[PDB]
Amino acid sequence: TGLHFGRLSLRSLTAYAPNLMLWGGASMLGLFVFTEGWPKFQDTLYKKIPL
Amino acid sequence: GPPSGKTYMGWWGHMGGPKQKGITSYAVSPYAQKPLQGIFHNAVFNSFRRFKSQFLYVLIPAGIYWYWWKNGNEYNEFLYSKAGREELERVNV
Amino acid sequence: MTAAEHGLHAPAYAWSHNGPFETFDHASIRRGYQVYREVCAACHSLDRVAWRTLVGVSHTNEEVRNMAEEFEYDDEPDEQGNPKKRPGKLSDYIPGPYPNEQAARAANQGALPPDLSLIVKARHGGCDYIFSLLTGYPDEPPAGVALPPGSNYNPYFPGGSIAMARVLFDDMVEYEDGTPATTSQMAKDVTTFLNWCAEPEHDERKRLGLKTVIILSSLYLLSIWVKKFKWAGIKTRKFVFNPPKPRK
Amino acid sequence: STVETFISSMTATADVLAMAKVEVNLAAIPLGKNVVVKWQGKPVFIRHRTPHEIQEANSVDMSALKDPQTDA
Amino acid sequence: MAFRKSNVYLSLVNSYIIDSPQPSSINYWWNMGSLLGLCLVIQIVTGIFMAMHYSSNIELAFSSVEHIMRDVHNGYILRYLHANGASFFFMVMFMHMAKGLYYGSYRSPRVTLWNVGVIIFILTIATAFLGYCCVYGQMSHWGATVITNLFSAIPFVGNDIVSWLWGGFSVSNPTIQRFFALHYLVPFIIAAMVIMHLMALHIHGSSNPLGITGNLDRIPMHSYFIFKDLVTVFLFMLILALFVFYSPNTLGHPDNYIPGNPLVTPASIVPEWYLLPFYAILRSIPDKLLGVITMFAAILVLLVLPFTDRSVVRGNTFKVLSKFFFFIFVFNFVLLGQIGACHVEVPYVLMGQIATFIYFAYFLIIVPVISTIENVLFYIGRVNK
Amino acid sequence: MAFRKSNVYLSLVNSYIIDSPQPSSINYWWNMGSLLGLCLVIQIVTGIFMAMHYSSNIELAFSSVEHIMRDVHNGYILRYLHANGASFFFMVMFMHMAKGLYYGSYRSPRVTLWNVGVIIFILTIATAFLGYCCVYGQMSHWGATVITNLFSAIPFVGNDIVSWLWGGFSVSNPTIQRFFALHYLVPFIIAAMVIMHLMALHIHGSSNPLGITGNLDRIPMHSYFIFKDLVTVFLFMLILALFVFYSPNTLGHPDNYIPGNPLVTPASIVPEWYLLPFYAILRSIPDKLLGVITMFAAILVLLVLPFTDRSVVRGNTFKVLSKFFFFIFVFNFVLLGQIGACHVEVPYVLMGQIATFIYFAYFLIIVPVISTIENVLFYIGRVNK
Amino acid sequence: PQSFTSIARIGDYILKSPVLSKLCVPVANQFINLAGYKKLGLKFDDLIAEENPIMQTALRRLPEDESYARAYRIIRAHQTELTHHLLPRNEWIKAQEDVPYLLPYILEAEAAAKEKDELDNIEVSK
Ligand SMILES: CCCCCCCCCCC(=O)OC[C@H](COP(=O)(O)OC[C@H](O)COP(=O)(O)OC[C@@H](COC(=O)CC)OC(=O)CCC)OC(=O)CCCCCCCC
Ligand SMILES: CCCCCCCCCCCCCCCCCC(=O)OC[C@H](COP(=O)(O)OCCN)OC(=O)CCCCCCCCCCCCC
Ligand SMILES: CCCCCCCCCCCCCCCCCC(=O)OC[C@H](COP(=O)(O)OCCN)OC(=O)CCCCCCCCCCCCC
Ligand code: HEC
Ligand code: HEC
Ligand code: HEC
Ligand code: HEC
Ligand code: HEC
Ligand SMILES: COc1c(O)c(C)c(C/C=C(\C)CC/C=C(\C)CC/C=C(/C)CC/C=C(\C)CC/C=C(\C)CCC=C(C)C)c(O)c1OC
Ligand SMILES: COc1c(O)c(C)c(C/C=C(\C)CC/C=C(\C)CC/C=C(\C)CC/C=C(\C)CC/C=C(/C)CCC=C(C)C)c(O)c1OC
Ligand SMILES: CCCCCCCCCCCCCCC(=O)O[C@H](COC(=O)CCCCCCCCCCCC)COP(=O)(O)O
Ligand SMILES: CCCCCCCCCCCCCCC(=O)O[C@H](COC(=O)CCCCCCCCCCCC)COP(=O)(O)O
Ligand SMILES: CCCCCCCCCCCCCCCCCC(=O)O[C@H](COC(=O)CCCCCC)COP(=O)(O)OCCN
Ligand SMILES: CCCCCCCCCCCCCCCCCC(=O)O[C@H](COC(=O)CCCCCC)COP(=O)(O)OCCN
């Protein structure tokens, strides 16, 4: 009847982690905004139809 | 202004130490006090006490690292001389 | 590195301007300028030393003016835009013998002679290094050293092979004051002159250092007294403790 | 757009991109001459080689090289 | 109430330098903070009065520095105070951080104070490096080249970051101009971080050399620690006046009086004297990327310090083994500086690697293990069973 | 409590821009302060990124400004934002000081706030003048010459003060270099004075456009005045974007694109547009010393303002004659600017003298007399006997 | 950050073993009298840092007379460290007076906080 804790709970960690993956996704969308115009990233950044 | 969190130092009056009772202070004005009466005999014997209790913790690391630096520097100026050039050849390759 | 690439250690010569109170020997600076002008100035620029700094240091006013008027500098052009020259004045700088870098490397077998305005402050050892460099050429290199042709040996240069020639020989210049001008005398004079050229503030720096060290030592001892004074109420403070009545 | 403006203002300017390339003449350098130039803030050694130096270059065994590489 | 308490502006002057309750047992090692403040004011005032005569073009930098040292009245005083005071600024800052490590001022509740201190340390290293590159001597040019190529080690992005830093293709006129602008700018960020540092200090007060509370016997700031700081201010000005007026070019490197030549590399490229342990840490790693990561980790490992000190008493005052290994660490840091000043030669590579390992082992292995052993030794020394 | 209240750093952010109790009746004229803060950040950031490409020699200043406008990527954006934003900085500051005079924010208990505001105004005029002389155009050189000869008017000392300012015998290379150093320096003093200004504001809170207390109905800073300031921030950026991108050189003087020539005097030497009322005040006095004293007294007469407003109600909102004479004063200040832009010709000398007299009479005679008459009129309008 | 239950467990494992006690109790009290907190007139429970809420709790727990004695020992330690001297040999804390007086208050606050954290993170017996 214990738990794996370090003041943060393992239940709490699995409760927040399906949102933390979306936080990583929105941060990658933020980098994809702020890093165009940089011609090194444009080897990857224009592929489908921004060209 | 807003309130702030609990600190561990208050101010003059509510400093936050434990309550104290029956502990009396005694101090004399420095105008009736002779300053630097305790420089002679003090800077000899108290300074030797402060050196004796406290030097060896500084002197052993200084000794270790100075001996290690001196042995390394001596081995450097050995193997970049004419005598140890074949040893420089075998340890540089 | 070995000792050959590092160069031999220049020893501790007892200069007349070492020590925290001794200044330059200005007669030695005057003779060092004479040896500079008659030996070094064929091949070394002195680009950062104006003429006005020698007035009152190693020469008088008219001496510097009549030494500067022997040279030609670029005047502003005339009323038809033609470039013209003018004799020098006190506000100009000491000109180099070479108009650009490529003429220097052409006239000195590729090696560029460094400007000597800061050369005693840009070498480790300093004065001792310059003096041992000048008076350090052997008559013949040690056995087993293959010099590249056109280069010379002295052990004080880092690597051993220098592209300078031994240019201090016995009595190649005459001194104005009649001092016997041997090689070591001329080398000591030019090293003192180059110390002046790198550090023209040296005299005033040491006397303002004397004033500042005296005033700050006096302030430090006075402040030790005032700290021991205003803390005397706190060093001698005493505490006695009779433990209180436990009924309360 | 503001971050692009204030960061791309610190990149290489127009005139330092102008001097990015040098256009040295092949017909002006002689055979037995080395040319040392300051290009792109760096030294560059230029040499017109002879075919015997080519034969000397491409016929040294690779085991005499700590980083072996052919001439072409 | 009094006017120093009721006024809005003088209440800060009051609550910081007049009626601040200080612990009455602090020795002269609690004076390096005031000394760093004085030395920062020295650096800023000499920087302004010397940057009124400085032209930051690459063809006019070294000539303008020599114009300061020759033509400007008392300009040699300004430059010599400025460079030697930067050396004393790092020496007093090293002594201040050693006071922090020794007496346990990093521990709770002063973790914010320690982190703002590490931020000030990084910004000061940046300021000193930029100002040393503003001289544009031989060492200035080639040190700027080596540090920015270290920034080119970053994978997939780094070359464009370095072409952004240089403003070109090598260390050229835009590089020196932007280093002068940044070097004028970053000390005011250091002043703002110092004010934030004083706030994070003032919310809990200073420590004391015993590691117990100091809430019982407080004495004010005014006249007591004012005149104690005045004592060390006059001693600091005395030693600075010695190394400015009698031997100014001792701490510097003589190659910095050669003008900046991109074609001639020096025989030994070495930074100025205080960045040498970090340069040795970076040179000890046989990789560029891991070298840069290890050089920045050698400062972030000061941030991981309050979480590894498992000693239940504050500070190394009353502990034997922690005090001994502290002086092992200090003389190891000096040995890092002296390894970095040497060449890449046998056996200095192996000693640089061992010295870097003992640095990181002190911050990560030695402190928690020795603190745990010292705790258990304090317990079983006095508890009988 | 909350983390924004218990943290040391975030408590200032809280008590200044999150939970600051603002009066809930303040209109958009209480937004110029946030607008001045934004425009100061604009000036500083463009100044840094444009001073990475600026060389401050007298032979290389104008060429480096044109190097910024031609060779630097987006450099025309930087210079045009910088100059036109300095113009908008003075326009928003003039509107802010007019908000101060109108609603009576200078009165007690806000005299410290008003005095720190006048200090910020003097430092900003100094910064704009130094940065305008850093361009070294025709107007820059000759304006620097005229202002420093005005400093030579000081008796028995002034010529040596001016040879100290110039660093020579006329406006030359040391003058432009020290103007660039001082011009880099003084905006950080302005930032420190702005922080002191915010402290002196925060100890009593803002006023309101009614002149009564606002302690009854307070609403927080956050989301309310945050989004109201965001509205005027976007309007300010819109108008700044118009005057930068579509008509950049309107507010400037076209003679400033002629390089600085000490031999050719211009046909009409005029400062940039906002210093023209002060230039007209100084030009209206037929004496050099009294002219300089009158020009500085035209700013110190703002300090003598809270001691002459004898109106017992705060602010000109509910008073007729004070509101009318306030707009007399505002259009008089505009007429001072337009007199100063003209030549020394009949009848502009006589109109400049009358306009200077109406300026000082508003600050010294009109306000106390009209406030006394308005007090007695308010009393006898409602009290019957 | 040692969590006094843990140091008490290790120390009791050392003390209850005869070999480990016979080996490292002379090392222990040699470490104690080389530490030199006795010579300033302090006890070791006067030396534990008290700027965390569990030790602050254990100082509220403490009786009055021991609190006044602890306050006097702290003030005499600050005064003796200020004068850069030591207390005379008659005023040093002896070996018998160095009693772990605050240890049980600290340990019961440790057990209380540990039990609160465990019960704050329990599962349910399904
Ligand atoms: C290198 C460039 C740095 C530039 C910084 C300039 C300031 C240097 C600071 C050095 C320092 O702060 O060390 C402090 C160290 C510890 O102090 P403490 O409180 O434990 O001693 C109490 C004192 O007896 C009270 O005595 P009192 O307070 O009455 O006077 C103290 C002394 C002032 O001296 C100093 O401040 C340090 C030299 O007055 C004199 O009598 C001087 C007689 C000529 O003082 C000592 O007692 C020495 C112990 C060994 C430290 C060696 C340092 C090597 C790095
Ligand atoms: C990247 C992170 C930065 C890390 C910085 C690395 C260290 C930088 C070096 C700066 C030198 C600072 C030395 C350490 C400063 C703290 C020392 C100290 O606190 O002094 C007090 C110490 C013990 O005194 P107590 O406080 O314990 O006395 C209580 C009485 N019962 O008293 C002593 O034990 C003697 C103190 C003597 C100091 C010796 C200094 C040696 C300096 C190096 C010399 C190099 C040449 C070999
Ligand atoms: C050295 C000292 C510096 C001194 C600077 C002197 C002024 C410099 C020029 C700055 C112009 C800014 C003027 C702003 C006037 C203050 C703001 C103001 O008073 O507006 C409110 C006013 C009355 O509003 P109430 O608060 O009385 O509302 C009552 C509700 N029952 O509403 C009104 O009465 C109408 C507001 C109309 C504003 C028009 C702005 C005019 C600008 C003149 C430019 C001229 C160009 C030709
Ligand atoms: C203008 C303001 C200015 C400020 C503020 C300033 N400096 Fe400098 N500093 C300069 C200038 C200009 C130079 C180059 C001229 C010189 O080196 O004499 C310089 C050079 C230096 C140098 C190289 C000195 C030399 O000649 O080798 C160092 C090191 C240095 N600064 C460190 C610092 C530190 C550390 C600080 C503050 C924390 C600081 N500077 C603040 C202007 C400033
Ligand atoms: C480096 C920091 C820097 C700061 C901070 C700064 N400026 Fe400037 N400013 C410059 C430079 C560089 C110039 C000259 C280049 C130019 O004019 O484009 C300049 C020029 C100016 C000019 C003349 C513009 C022109 O081209 O006619 C004005 C007006 C001005 N500044 C006002 C201000 C004001 C007002 C502030 C802040 C309160 C300010 N500056 C802050 C760097 C700065
Ligand atoms: C023959 C022409 C010539 C003359 C005459 C000459 N020099 Fe040199 N000197 C050189 C050259 C070439 C170098 C460059 C050496 C090198 O780069 O390897 C040089 C370098 C030096 C150096 C720097 C050496 C180093 O390793 O850094 C010093 C110092 C020096 N000369 C002093 C003098 C002095 C003093 C005189 C006047 C007595 C003088 N020289 C006259 C050709 C000359
Ligand atoms: C990396 C560590 C560190 C650096 C670097 C640092 N500080 Fe501190 N500072 C501290 C710590 C920790 C304290 C409190 C230590 C204590 O009281 O036990 C402190 C305290 C102070 C104090 C209070 C007096 C004192 O000595 O405790 C002042 C003032 C101060 N710092 C100013 C500065 C200034 C100015 C700088 C440089 C600009 C600086 N500090 C750099 C960590 C640092
Ligand atoms: C000399 C007049 C004056 C000047 C100049 C001035 N201020 Fe103010 N400022 C005031 C007054 C008066 C208030 C109080 C408003 C009131 O009456 O309630 C104020 C209030 C403010 C406020 C609070 C918001 C507001 O609108 O009241 C800010 C923010 C502010 N000032 C910023 C600045 C900044 C930023 C500057 C320039 C950098 C500046 N001020 C210059 C007089 C001035
Ligand atoms: C009365 O109610 C209030 C109120 O209480 C407050 C507080 C405000 C808010 C006040 C302000 C926001 C003004 C604050 C202004 C300052 C604090 C000035 C600080 C300005 C700065 C520019 C800070 C300095 C920072 C820098 C110089 C950093 C720039 C560095 C750069 C760009 C480095 C670039 C280099 C590289 C390599 C990236 C109000 O607007 C307000 O009315 C609603
Ligand atoms: C813990 O208790 C404390 C404590 O609370 C404090 C505050 C201090 C004091 C610490 C400091 C003061 C450090 C803080 C340092 C700063 C905030 C730096 C401030 C410096 C500047 C902002 C730069 C100075 C700028 C000027 C003087 C502007 C004027 C300069 C020039 C060049 C103008 C000249 C131009 C002309 C035309 C004459 C302590 O020492 C201390 O321990 C006792
Ligand atoms: C921002 C720069 C920070 C630098 C840190 C400096 C820390 C020490 C500051 C010393 C200030 C001394 C004021 C004492 C005082 O006013 O006491 C006044 C009067 O004391 C004095 O007159 C002292 C004599 C004059 C000493 C002048 C020292 C100037 C040198 C300063 C060098 C550093 C700037 C109050 O003294 P009282 O309360 O005991 O009566
Ligand atoms: C130091 C420089 C001072 C400049 C003065 C600027 C004054 C206005 C600042 C506006 C900040 C807006 C934050 C509001 C917020 O976070 O609310 C947050 C969320 O609101 C938002 O998401 C706003 C949408 C995004 C707006 C972004 C605006 C950026 C443009 C700023 C341009 C000026 C820098 C809290 O909102 P809530 O409490 O109502 O839930
Ligand atoms: C680098 C600083 C960064 C920010 C930190 C802020 C700390 C600033 C420390 C400044 C200490 C010295 C300031 C002394 C000023 C005290 C005079 C005073 O408060 O009198 C004030 C008036 O102040 C002024 O008019 C001019 C103040 C300009 C200050 C510019 C330096 C009297 O006002 P009073 O408090 O009695 O309120 C009554 C309301 N009628
Ligand atoms: C002249 C004044 C100039 C302006 C200075 C005053 C305004 C400063 C505003 C700063 C706003 C941003 C600061 C927010 C950061 C809050 C994080 C924090 O406080 O956590 C701190 C730790 O902070 C750090 O480690 C480094 C912070 C450096 C900040 C560098 C900008 C922990 O704080 P605390 O002790 O309350 O946490 C207990 C855990 N429950």
Side-chain angles (χ1 to χ4, degrees), chain B residues 8 16 18-21 23 42 46 49-50 53 57, chain G residues 51-53 56 67-68 70-72 75 84-86:
Chain B
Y8 289 146
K19 291 183 183 293
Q20 57 192 354
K21 179 172 176 68
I23 174 169
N42 198 0
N46 194 7
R49 193 265 305 159
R50 292 175 71 191
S53 296
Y57 297 147
Chain G
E51 291 170 353
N52 45 354
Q56 192 63 252
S67 177
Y68 302 125
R70 192 183 70 88
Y72 173 64
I75 293 173
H84 298 286
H85 294 288
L86 268 62

Side-chain angles (χ1 to χ4, degrees), chain E residues 1-64:
Chain E
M1 57 175 67
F3 189 77
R4 73 178 183 273
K5 299 172 74 174
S6 69
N7 195 4
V8 49
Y9 292 144
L10 288 174
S11 67
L12 292 181
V13 176
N14 192 11
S15 64
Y16 280 99
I17 64 170
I18 292 175
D19 287 334
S20 177
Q22 299 291 317
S24 65
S25 68
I26 55 173
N27 54 11
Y28 287 97
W29 295 106
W30 273 264
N31 204 343
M32 304 300 171
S34 66
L35 209 62
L36 284 173
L38 183 271
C39 192
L40 181 64
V41 175
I42 285 177
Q43 291 296 310
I44 290 174
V45 175
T46 61
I48 303 301
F49 285 101
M50 190 176 63
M52 299 178 192
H53 301 284
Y54 181 78
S55 295
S56 63
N57 297 109
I58 194 170
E59 63 183 1
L60 297 177
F62 189 78
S63 297
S64 64

Side-chain angles (χ1 to χ4, degrees), chain F residues 40 43 47 50-51 79 82-83 86 127 131-132 135 180 183-184 187 274:
Chain F
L40 181 64
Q43 291 296 310
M50 190 176 63
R79 183 191 166 186
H82 196 78
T127 298
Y132 189 71
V135 177
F180 178 68
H183 174 65
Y184 208 113
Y274 44 83

Side-chain angles (χ1 to χ4, degrees), chain E residues 72-219:
Chain E
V72 177
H73 296 287
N74 298 317
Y76 60 94
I77 294 170
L78 298 178
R79 183 191 166 186
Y80 280 155
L81 275 174
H82 196 78
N84 292 315
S87 293
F88 280 110
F89 194 75
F90 274 84
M91 190 64 203
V92 176
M93 185 180 289
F94 278 160
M95 294 168 72
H96 191 85
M97 295 164 70
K99 182 267 298 294
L101 268 77
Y102 182 73
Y103 292 109
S105 293
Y106 54 89
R107 298 176 75 252
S108 178
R110 294 178 181 90
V111 182
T112 303
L113 185 61
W114 182 249
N115 298 328
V116 176
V118 174
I119 290 172
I120 292 174
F121 180 66
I122 291 172
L123 292 176
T124 303
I125 288 175
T127 298
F129 177 74
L130 296 175
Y132 189 71
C133 295
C134 290
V135 177
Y136 193 68
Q138 195 72 37
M139 287 292 108
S140 299
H141 180 83
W142 287 92
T145 297
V146 171
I147 297 302
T148 57
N149 291 322
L150 266 47
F151 283 106
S152 71
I154 291 171
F156 292 157
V157 188
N159 292 316
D160 295 332
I161 301 172
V162 172
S163 296
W164 176 71
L165 282 176
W166 284 342
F169 298 101
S170 67
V171 181
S172 61
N173 196 5
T175 308
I176 300 301
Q177 286 181 352
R178 70 185 62 183
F179 281 179
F180 178 68
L182 268 296
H183 174 65
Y184 208 113
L185 185 270
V186 182
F188 294 102
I189 298 177
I190 292 174
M193 291 299 112
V194 161
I195 293 171
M196 291 176 66
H197 189 82
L198 293 175
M199 293 172 61
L201 171 67
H202 186 270
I203 62 167
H204 287 88
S206 299
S207 174
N208 50 1
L210 299 179
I212 59 175
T213 187
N215 292 317
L216 280 79
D217 189 68
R218 295 275 183 175
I219 57 176

Side-chain angles (χ1 to χ4, degrees), chain F residues 76 80 84 238-250:
Chain F
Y76 60 94
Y80 280 155
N84 292 315
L238 191 275
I239 300 172
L240 177 60
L242 290 177
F243 279 180
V244 163
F245 283 143
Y246 286 167
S247 180
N249 293 314
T250 301

Side-chain angles (χ1 to χ4, degrees), chain E residues 246-375:
Chain E
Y246 286 167
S247 180
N249 293 314
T250 301
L251 297 173
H253 200 198
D255 287 332
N256 204 6
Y257 291 98
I258 300 168
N261 194 359
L263 298 177
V264 174
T265 181
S268 67
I269 170 174
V270 169
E272 66 272 21
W273 62 272
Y274 44 83
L275 297 175
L276 271 309
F278 298 141
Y279 186 78
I281 290 167
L282 180 135
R283 203 179 70 236
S284 297
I285 302 300
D287 185 79
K288 291 183 181 180
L289 177 62
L290 294 174
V292 177
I293 291 169
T294 301
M295 183 182 71
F296 286 105
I299 306 170
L300 303 179
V301 76
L302 275 79
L303 296 181
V304 304
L305 186 60
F307 297 147
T308 58
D309 193 2
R310 294 179 66 85
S311 178
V312 80
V313 295
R314 180 177 293 115
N316 298 318
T317 303
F318 292 147
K319 300 193 290 289
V320 178
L321 294 173
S322 295
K323 199 188 294 183
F324 180 75
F325 281 150
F326 175 72
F327 284 108
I328 288 291
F329 172 73
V330 175
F331 290 148
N332 192 14
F333 187 76
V334 178
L335 193 273
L336 262 312
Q338 191 62 42
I339 288 297
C342 292
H343 296 283
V344 187
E345 294 171 358
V346 175
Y348 298 100
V349 176
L350 189 272
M351 288 182 182
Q353 292 173 355
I354 288 176
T356 304
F357 178 70
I358 295 172
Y359 185 86
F360 284 155
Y362 178 73
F363 271 146
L364 292 174
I365 297 171
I366 290 170
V367 166
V369 170
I370 292 299
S371 66
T372 299
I373 294 170
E374 278 172 342
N375 284 327

Side-chain angles (χ1 to χ4, degrees), chain C residues 230, chain E residues 34 38 41 222-223 226-227 229-230 233-234:
Chain C
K230 291 185 181 295
Chain E
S34 66
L38 183 271
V41 175
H222 186 69
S223 300
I226 293 299
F227 282 94
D229 302 352
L230 188 60
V233 159
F234 283 154

